[PDB]
Amino acid sequence: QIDLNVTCRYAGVFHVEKNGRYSISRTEAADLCQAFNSTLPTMDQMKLALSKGFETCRYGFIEGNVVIPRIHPNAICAANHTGVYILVTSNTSHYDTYCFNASAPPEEDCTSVTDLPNSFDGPVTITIVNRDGTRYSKKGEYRTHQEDI
């Protein structure tokens, strides 16, 4: 079983956390976004999302970097920084991910995610968990690198 907690989309950008813990490698992140018919966001896509209301208190991959979007300063979320905070120094390699779906609405979309449209055949029960608790499950796989499995 894999549980994927997903946020609202902001100009197509959303956050995904796997199994309630920082647990996604950079290769898994890319695979996960693809399974959502999405891509790792660019910095510019993130910046537009943050301008529309997107913030989290989680490190996650984008294309090229690990970031936290911050609107309000909070001392335990990117050490009180605002903006798209870029992680500079870390020993470790596993984070959450962000994803970008170009077909999402242009502003804030807090409707539930109901589908992992490009997951492939496989043995895993994958459950999408929305913040309101609504869940969607399917049997499949999305990880293409053996080292991530």
Ligand X SMILES: CC(=O)N[C@@H]1[C@@H](O[C@@H]2O[C@H](C(=O)O)[C@@H](O[C@@H]3O[C@H](CO)[C@@H](O)[C@H](O[C@@H]4O[C@H](C(=O)O)[C@@H](O[C@@H]5O[C@H](CO)[C@@H](O)[C@H](O[C@@H]6O[C@H](C(=O)O)[C@@H](O[C@@H]7O[C@H](CO)[C@@H](O)[C@H](O)[C@H]7NC(C)=O)[C@H](O)[C@H]6O)[C@H]5NC(C)=O)[C@H](O)[C@H]4O)[C@H]3NC(C)=O)[C@H](O)[C@H]2O)[C@H](O)[C@@H](CO)O[C@H]1O
Residue ranges for the known binding site are 21, 58-59, 85
| Residues sharing a CB contact under 8 Å with residue 49, sequence separation 6 or more, in sequence order | 10, 11, 12, 13, 41, 69
For residue 149, state whether it binds ligand X (rule: CB under 6 A): no
Quote the distance between the C-alpha of residue 101 and its chain's center.
11
Binder among 59, 61, 98, 100 for ligand X (CB under 6 A): 59
Binder among 23, 57, 93, 139 for ligand X (CB under 6 A): 57
Site string for ligand X, 71-110 (x = CB under 6 A): ---x-xxxx-------------------------------
Long-range contacts of 87-93 (CB under 8 A, 24+ apart): 87/59, 90/66, 93/25, 93/26
DSSP state of 56: -
By CB under 6 A, the residues from 13 to 32 that bind ligand X are none
How many angstroms separate the CA atoms of 51 and 48, rounded?
Answer: 5
Nearer to ligand X, 75 or 103 (CB): 75
By CB under 6 A, the residues from 115 to 144 that bind ligand X are none
Q: What would the two tokens of residue 77 be? A: 């979320």
Annotated binding site for hyaluronan: 21, 58-59, 85
Q: Which residues bind ligand X (CB under 6 A)?
A: 57-59, 68, 74, 76-79
